[PDB]
Every structure is written in structure tokens, then in C-alpha cells.
Amino acid sequence: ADLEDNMETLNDNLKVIEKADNAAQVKDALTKMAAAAADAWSATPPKLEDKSPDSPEMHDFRHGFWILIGQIHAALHLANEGKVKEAQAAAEQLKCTCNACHQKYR
Amino acid sequence: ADLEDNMETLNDNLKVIEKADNAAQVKDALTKMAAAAADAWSATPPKLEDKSPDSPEMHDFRHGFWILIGQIHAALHLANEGKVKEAQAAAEQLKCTCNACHQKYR
Amino acid sequence: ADLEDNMETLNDNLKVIEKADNAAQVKDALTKMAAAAADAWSATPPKLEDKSPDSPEMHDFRHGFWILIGQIHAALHLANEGKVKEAQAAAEQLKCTCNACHQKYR
Amino acid sequence: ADLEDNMETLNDNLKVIEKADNAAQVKDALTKMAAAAADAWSATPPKLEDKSPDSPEMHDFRHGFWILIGQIHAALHLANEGKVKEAQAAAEQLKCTCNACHQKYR
Ligand code: HEC
Ligand code: HEC
Ligand code: HEC
Ligand code: HEC
Ligand SMILES: [Co+2]
Ligand SMILES: [Co+2]
Ligand SMILES: [Co+2]
């Protein structure tokens, strides 16, 4: 999917996680975030189009998704074992990763 | 120093970094925040003084300073590279982690 | 490429790095290793193939490539700074992470 | 405690974890490792004695304990859950962090 749609998927499912009651909903929302992040890994953002696909900026772009994916993965571990509030607090910290990439590249 | 002094250190040195002119000034303030974060790591915040030190809430509290310290290290690494403005942007992003802990435990 | 071929790309490029004489060779090789690692991410290894894709085992498998990719990125960071010796030593240390996953899933 | 005594604690408790047989054993050994890495953070290694305490080298040194403490804390999360196999696998991957710092600064 394109970068914009993966970003909507990330945004929509963070909202799902915030308002969720129960493990299964959080787990499904995180699984979809992980898939959208993995898909977005390979995109070139509008503001880096004139940069070489191996420039530091493009490396650091992919590095932001690497951080995000690890955080999603860890939240998924918590959700998978029923720790819903812990998973939600993990999701609130990973918002900071969204913000840091957005400040540099959005 | 106690937890309240550490937080004032963190807060004050965010302002120092924002208005700094050169890499040495950023590096010194970040060093002070790394020390105040490492010191707060072992504190018990008032809202958790009725939980056990070996409790999921205290482990999360401690984990929060570990996150903050890694982000402070990343910003120092930029300062050690002479990248003043980048280190300053990274110091600004710390606020998201400050807030994420405060939401839970302040 | 399949997992086999990703694994063989990782093996070959470690040698490339080991015998490299400039930063551009090391960067190149580390970039191909990052690529193959990301490709190996989504694979299912034989020894887990009668296992649920949601199992702790398959989560751990994926986590192992997340670890590897992070170390490769750190080695790339050093290569971008022209630190051929540091980047080579970091590359050589990747073998511990290679070996650690092999011990579990091979 | 001195750096040697902390490394002895780290080393001895790795071995206990590899040969442990109940949860509390792993948890207690990890808890001790957590403490020893915390203490060691603030030390100066012999090969870095004639370097500025705020040089990149001493910063990288401290950062290596930051990585190690993070990994110990994730292993401890598993142990505190009853996931002892898990946690022992996490223990094996920590060795790579030991080795990487040793190669550089021991
Ligand atoms: C990141 C850089 C920051 C900054 C700038 C601040 N904090 Fe914290 N903080 C935490 C707790 C539990 C408290 C309550 C302390 C108490 O009531 O005793 C605070 C408080 C503060 C303050 C107010 C201090 C006061 O005297 O009332 C300020 C100005 C402040 N902080 C700044 C806990 C945490 C964290 C736990 C993991 C983290 C991380 C931060 N705070 C981060 C920051
Ligand atoms: C990870 C779990 C480990 C383990 C099991 C050990 N270390 Fe370290 N280590 C570091 C340095 C600078 C030294 C030399 C200290 C000196 O010269 O005084 C060591 C040494 C050791 C030893 C040998 C102790 C002896 O006196 O012979 C042992 C058994 C040992 N270590 C175990 C530095 C670091 C780190 C810095 C970031 C990290 C992390 C580790 N070591 C990790 C571990
Ligand atoms: C880089 C490493 C990023 C991370 C991590 C996250 N986002 Fe992002 N996002 C990024 C870019 C470069 C852009 C601009 C894309 C474009 O085509 O202009 C975006 C955009 C968004 C948007 C707006 C999408 C749109 O319709 O234009 C949203 C809603 C968004 N991102 C959300 C989001 C969330 C919730 C994230 C963490 C969970 C996140 N993004 C991470 C780059 C990066
Ligand atoms: C798990 C997270 C792994 C990491 C990290 C690395 N490897 Fe790997 N490797 C893994 C598996 C499950 C296998 C078995 C593949 C199979 O289909 O049986 C392998 C295999 C290899 C091989 C042999 C290739 C072959 O066709 O048999 C090699 C040379 C190899 N692996 C090397 C290697 C290197 C150099 C790595 C990192 C730099 C590395 N592996 C990481 C799982 C995982
Ligand atoms: Co579209
Ligand atoms: Co492929
Ligand atoms: Co768990």
C-alpha cells in the first residue's frame, strides 16, 4: 500500500488501541500496525524524493520504522498474554516515535 | 538529590539546551540531564509508595527513565558530533517521554 | 529471495566487509546485509514450520532479525563516518547474533 | 563495588541462569545482574583511564551498560512471568552485548 495509506492504518489503529476494552481488539490493532509499518519501511517520503536511496536521510528514515516496529512488537507481546493496560501504555510511548520521525520527514 | 530536584534539573536543562549557542553548552546540559535521570531511576514517586519496589508499576517507572536516558544518550551522541541543531531537536522530543511517564505516575 | 539465499547473502557480505579496504565497500556490503535481513524477517524457518505464526517461537524468530537489523544499522552509521576499522569490528560482532538464532531455530 | 567485582557478579549469575531450574533462581540471578550493571555504569575501565570522562569513549562505555541493562530488564520481565525458557534464551543473547563491549574496552 502507499505510504499515506499505511500512515492512516497506523493512525486508525492507535485510536482503536486507546479506546479498547480487551486483549483481542488491542492485539488485532497492533498486528495491523506491525503490517503497515513493515509495508512502509520501503517507501520514499515526498520530502526525501531528491535524496539518494542510500543517503543518511533514507537510512535514518528506515531506522525510524525499525524503532517503531520493535515497539509495536513489544506491545504485541503484552497484548498476546492479556496485559491490555500495559500494551496500551506501550502504545502511548510509541506515539513519541511517530512524532520524532514526523518532525524530521513529514 | 531527591526526585523533585532531579525533575527540576531535567526541566531547567531543557531550557538551557533550547537557548544554547554551541555544542559544548548542549553537551554539558545533556550530561546533567543524564545524571538526574540516572538518579531518579531509583526513586519511588509518591503515587507508587504504596506499591512494592518489585511491582509492575515500579518496573514500568524504572523502564521510563531507561527510555529517557537512551534518548538523552542519542542527543549527546549528536552533540559529540558537533551537530548542535540536531541535538537540539532531539532534546525537544524528550518532552514526549517526559509527558508519557507523568500521565501515568505524576 | 528465499531464506536460504538471504542467509547466503549475509554470509558472503560478512567476508566482503572483513576484506574491505575502504568505507564505500563496507557501506555497500552492510546495505546488502540490511536488505537480506529485512527479506528474512517475513520468512518461516523449517524448524518452526509446524508452528503457529503467532507462537512465541515465531515472535522470537522475527525479534532476532530485528536485533540483527539494528546492529547492521549501527555498523552502517560507523561506515558513513568513514570509520572502516570500527565498522568492521561491529560487523564481526554480528556473528554472535547470527549464532544465537541458529542455536535456537536451526 | 569495583568494576571487577561487578563483572564477577555478572559472570557468575549468567552461569546460574544457564543451569537454573526454577523461576526464582533465574529471577534472582537477573536481579543481581541488574544491580551489578547499574553499579558498573559509573566506573572507569583501565584502558580508558587516561581519557576525558566525557569523551565519546567514556560515553560509548556507559551506553554499553545501558544496552545491557535494557536486555536484563526484558529477561527479568519474562522471568517475573513464569516464562523461564524464554528468559534463558534472552540470557544467551545478552552475551553478545558482553562480548562487544569487551572487544572494545577490556
Ligand atoms: C523529561 C525531560 C522530564 C522533565 C523535563 C520533567 N520530568 Fe518528571 N516527574 C515524574 C514524577 C513521578 C513526578 C512527580 C514528582 C512528585 O510529585 O514528587 C515528576 C515531576 C516533574 C516536575 C514537577 C516537579 C515538582 O516539584 O512538582 C517537573 C517540572 C518535571 N517532572 C519535569 C516522573 C518522570 C519520569 C519517569 C519515568 C520521567 C521520564 C519524567 N518524569 C520526565 C521528565
Ligand atoms: C555480560 C553479561 C558480561 C559479563 C558476563 C562480563 N562482562 Fe565485562 N568487562 C568490561 C571491562 C572494561 C572489563 C575489564 C575490567 C578490568 O580490567 O578491571 C570487563 C571484564 C570482565 C570479566 C573479567 C574480570 C576479571 O577481573 O578477569 C568478566 C568475567 C566479565 N567482564 C564478565 C566491560 C563490560 C561492559 C561495558 C559496557 C559490559 C556491558 C560487560 N563488560 C559485560 C559483561
Ligand atoms: C518515519 C520513520 C515515520 C514514522 C515512524 C511514522 N510516520 Fe507517519 N508519516 C511519515 C511521513 C514521511 C509522512 C508524510 C507522508 C506523505 O505522503 O506526505 C507521514 C504521514 C502520516 C500521517 C498523515 C498521512 C496523510 O494522509 O497524509 C499520519 C496520520 C501518520 N503519519 C500517522 C503516524 C502514526 C500514528 C505513527 C506511529 C504509530 C507514524 N505515523 C509513524 C513518517 C513516519
Ligand atoms: C534468526 C533470527 C537468524 C539470524 C539472525 C541469522 N540466521 Fe542464518 N539462518 C537462520 C536459519 C533458520 C537458518 C536455517 C535455514 C534453513 O532453511 O534451514 C539459517 C541458515 C544460515 C546459513 C546456511 C544457508 C543454507 O542454505 O543452509 C548461513 C550461511 C547463515 N544462516 C548465516 C547467517 C549469517 C551470516 C547471519 C548474520 C549475519 C545469520 N545467518 C543470521 C536463522 C537466522
Ligand atoms: Co492511496
Ligand atoms: Co526475497
Ligand atoms: Co510478558
Side-chain angles (χ1 to χ4, degrees):
Chain A
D2 57 59
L3 185 52
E4 274 190 15
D5 292 343
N6 288 323
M7 288 301 166
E8 277 319 314
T9 300
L10 287 166
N11 195 50
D12 288 344
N13 280 285
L14 261 180
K15 289 179 194 155
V16 170
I17 289 158
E18 274 160 44
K19 303 143 154 173
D21 279 348
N22 59 96
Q25 162 162 225
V26 168
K27 176 186 169 39
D28 178 62
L30 283 163
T31 302
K32 298 171 175 178
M33 303 187 58
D39 197 32
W41 169 285
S42 64
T44 293
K47 280 168 148 144
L48 301 185
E49 287 199 18
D50 64 342
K51 295 294 181 123
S52 179
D54 295 331
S55 63
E57 316 77 8
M58 289 294 306
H59 175 240
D60 186 60
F61 187 66
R62 286 180 296 264
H63 191 67
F65 281 116
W66 175 84
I67 302 153
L68 191 76
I69 287 165
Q71 282 173 323
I72 292 169
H73 183 102
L76 200 41
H77 168 88
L78 296 166
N80 276 357
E81 58 196 7
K83 282 163 181 204
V84 173
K85 281 166 82 33
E86 305 98 305
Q88 285 165 312
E92 190 69 29
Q93 180 65 42
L94 73 88
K95 266 169 193 213
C96 300
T97 306
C98 317
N99 297 349
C101 183
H102 288 163
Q103 267 315 297
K104 282 142 55 153
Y105 301 121
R106 191 181 165 164
Chain B
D2 62 5
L3 184 62
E4 289 203 53
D5 285 23
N6 293 334
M7 297 298 158
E8 307 299 329
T9 299
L10 292 172
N11 201 47
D12 291 339
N13 278 280
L14 270 187
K15 167 260 293 112
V16 167
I17 292 161
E18 191 183 34
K19 309 203 182 228
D21 296 298
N22 57 66
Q25 303 171 288
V26 168
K27 170 165 172 187
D28 166 267
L30 285 170
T31 299
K32 297 161 181 206
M33 323 174 66
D39 185 22
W41 200 331
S42 50
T44 308
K47 299 207 178 328
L48 298 175
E49 46 185 58
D50 286 337
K51 295 262 172 263
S52 182
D54 184 6
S55 67
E57 292 79 19
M58 304 290 305
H59 294 296
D60 189 46
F61 186 78
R62 292 187 282 266
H63 185 66
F65 287 109
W66 180 88
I67 295 168
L68 188 77
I69 288 166
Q71 286 169 317
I72 290 167
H73 281 194
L76 293 173
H77 181 105
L78 290 161
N80 282 338
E81 288 178 348
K83 310 182 172 143
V84 189
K85 182 73 269 313
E86 291 183 45
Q88 278 173 310
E92 271 302 299
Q93 292 297 136
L94 296 171
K95 280 159 175 176
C96 184
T97 295
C98 310
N99 294 151
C101 175
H102 292 164
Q103 279 312 90
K104 292 185 286 183
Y105 302 127
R106 169 156 74 166
Chain C
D2 52 47
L3 180 59
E4 293 86 316
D5 271 315
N6 290 328
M7 286 310 151
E8 155 187 327
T9 299
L10 294 166
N11 206 25
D12 295 348
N13 276 280
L14 273 180
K15 304 190 207 132
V16 170
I17 288 154
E18 174 212 296
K19 310 198 271 273
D21 302 301
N22 59 60
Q25 312 171 298
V26 176
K27 295 182 235 173
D28 186 274
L30 287 168
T31 300
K32 297 168 165 144
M33 276 170 86
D39 198 333
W41 280 344
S42 57
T44 302
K47 186 68 71 174
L48 291 176
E49 206 181 17
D50 303 1
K51 197 80 57 162
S52 168
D54 181 354
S55 50
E57 290 92 340
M58 287 282 317
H59 280 274
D60 184 59
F61 184 79
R62 281 180 306 256
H63 186 56
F65 285 109
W66 182 88
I67 295 179
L68 185 72
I69 288 167
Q71 300 173 294
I72 293 162
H73 284 194
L76 262 179
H77 176 100
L78 292 167
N80 289 338
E81 304 176 335
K83 282 158 190 293
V84 309
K85 298 200 183 319
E86 288 86 322
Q88 286 175 309
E92 205 53 16
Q93 291 293 145
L94 294 172
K95 268 159 181 173
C96 187
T97 300
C98 315
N99 293 348
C101 176
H102 296 160
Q103 277 304 300
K104 295 178 298 182
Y105 300 123
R106 198 178 172 203
Chain D
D2 66 38
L3 186 57
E4 293 190 341
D5 292 332
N6 287 319
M7 295 299 154
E8 155 167 48
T9 312
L10 287 172
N11 196 54
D12 292 345
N13 280 287
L14 268 175
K15 285 165 179 343
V16 169
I17 286 152
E18 318 187 322
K19 292 159 187 191
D21 196 355
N22 50 74
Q25 261 162 9
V26 177
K27 183 188 175 141
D28 179 89
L30 286 173
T31 300
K32 295 166 163 163
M33 310 180 71
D39 185 354
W41 189 310
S42 78
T44 301
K47 291 182 186 294
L48 284 195
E49 264 184 350
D50 275 336
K51 289 295 245 128
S52 167
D54 286 316
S55 50
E57 286 86 18
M58 290 285 308
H59 182 233
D60 193 50
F61 183 72
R62 284 185 290 271
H63 189 257
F65 287 108
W66 178 85
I67 289 167
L68 192 79
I69 285 155
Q71 297 182 297
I72 291 166
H73 279 158
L76 198 47
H77 167 92
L78 292 167
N80 292 352
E81 285 186 321
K83 312 191 162 175
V84 176
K85 296 279 154 173
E86 290 78 359
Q88 304 183 319
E92 271 305 291
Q93 181 62 230
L94 298 84
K95 297 197 201 179
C96 306
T97 300
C98 316
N99 298 335
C101 178
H102 291 165
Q103 190 264 8
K104 267 183 289 193
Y105 305 132
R106 163 146 75 75

Coordinates of all heavy atoms in Angstrom, one line a residue, chain C residues 3 19 21 23-24 28-29 38 54 67-68 76 82 93 97-98 104:
Chain C
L3 N 14.9 -17.7 2.1 CA 15.6 -17.5 3.4 C 17.1 -18.0 3.2 O 18.0 -17.3 3.5 CB 14.9 -18.3 4.5 CG 15.5 -18.3 5.9 CD1 15.6 -16.9 6.4 CD2 14.6 -19.1 6.8
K19 N 37.4 -8.2 4.4 CA 38.5 -7.9 3.5 C 38.4 -6.6 2.9 O 39.1 -6.3 1.8 CB 38.5 -9.0 2.4 CG 38.4 -10.4 2.9 CD 38.9 -11.4 1.8 CE 37.7 -11.8 0.9 NZ 37.1 -13.0 1.6
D21 N 38.8 -2.6 2.0 CA 39.8 -1.6 2.2 C 39.3 -0.1 2.3 O 40.1 0.8 2.6 CB 40.9 -1.6 1.1 CG 41.6 -3.0 1.1 OD1 42.1 -3.4 2.1 OD2 41.5 -3.6 0.0
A23 N 35.7 2.6 3.1 CA 34.4 2.8 3.7 C 33.3 2.5 2.7 O 32.2 2.0 3.1 CB 34.2 4.2 4.3
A24 N 33.5 2.8 1.5 CA 32.4 2.6 0.5 C 32.2 1.1 0.3 O 31.0 0.7 0.1 CB 32.8 3.3 -0.8
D28 N 28.5 -0.5 1.2 CA 27.8 -1.4 0.2 C 27.4 -2.7 0.8 O 26.3 -3.1 0.7 CB 28.7 -1.6 -1.0 CG 27.9 -2.4 -2.1 OD1 28.0 -3.7 -2.0 OD2 27.3 -1.8 -3.0
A29 N 28.4 -3.4 1.5 CA 28.1 -4.7 2.0 C 27.1 -4.7 3.1 O 26.2 -5.5 3.1 CB 29.4 -5.3 2.4
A38 N 16.1 -7.8 6.2 CA 14.7 -7.4 6.1 C 13.8 -8.4 5.3 O 12.7 -8.7 5.7 CB 14.5 -6.0 5.5
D54 N 1.8 -17.1 15.2 CA 1.6 -16.3 16.4 C 2.4 -16.8 17.6 O 2.4 -16.3 18.7 CB 0.1 -16.1 16.6 CG -0.2 -15.2 17.8 OD1 0.6 -14.6 18.6 OD2 -1.5 -15.0 18.0
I67 N 16.8 -7.6 16.0 CA 18.1 -7.3 16.6 C 19.2 -7.2 15.6 O 20.0 -6.2 15.6 CB 18.5 -8.5 17.6 CG1 17.5 -8.5 18.8 CG2 19.9 -8.3 18.1 CD1 17.7 -9.7 19.8
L68 N 19.3 -8.2 14.7 CA 20.4 -8.1 13.7 C 20.3 -6.8 12.9 O 21.3 -6.1 12.7 CB 20.2 -9.4 12.8 CG 21.3 -9.4 11.7 CD1 22.6 -9.8 12.4 CD2 21.0 -10.4 10.6
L76 N 26.5 0.4 9.8 CA 26.4 1.4 8.8 C 26.6 2.8 9.3 O 27.2 3.6 8.5 CB 25.0 1.4 8.2 CG 24.8 0.6 6.9 CD1 23.3 0.7 6.5 CD2 25.6 1.3 5.8
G82 N 33.1 7.0 7.9 CA 34.4 6.6 7.4 C 35.2 5.9 8.4 O 36.5 5.8 8.3
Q93 N 31.2 -8.6 15.1 CA 30.4 -8.9 16.3 C 29.0 -9.4 15.9 O 28.3 -10.0 16.8 CB 30.3 -7.7 17.2 CG 31.6 -7.3 17.9 CD 32.0 -8.4 19.0 OE1 33.2 -8.6 19.1 NE2 31.1 -9.0 19.7
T97 N 25.0 -12.7 17.1 CA 23.6 -12.7 16.9 C 23.2 -13.7 15.9 O 22.1 -14.4 16.0 CB 23.2 -11.3 16.5 OG1 23.5 -10.4 17.5 CG2 21.6 -11.2 16.2
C98 N 23.9 -13.9 14.8 CA 23.7 -15.0 13.9 C 23.7 -16.3 14.6 O 22.8 -17.1 14.5 CB 24.9 -15.1 12.9 SG 25.4 -13.5 12.2
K104 N 18.9 -21.7 18.2 CA 17.5 -21.9 18.6 C 16.7 -22.6 17.5 O 15.8 -23.4 17.8 CB 16.8 -20.7 19.1 CG 17.4 -20.1 20.4 CD 16.8 -18.8 20.9 CE 16.9 -17.7 19.9 NZ 16.3 -16.4 20.4

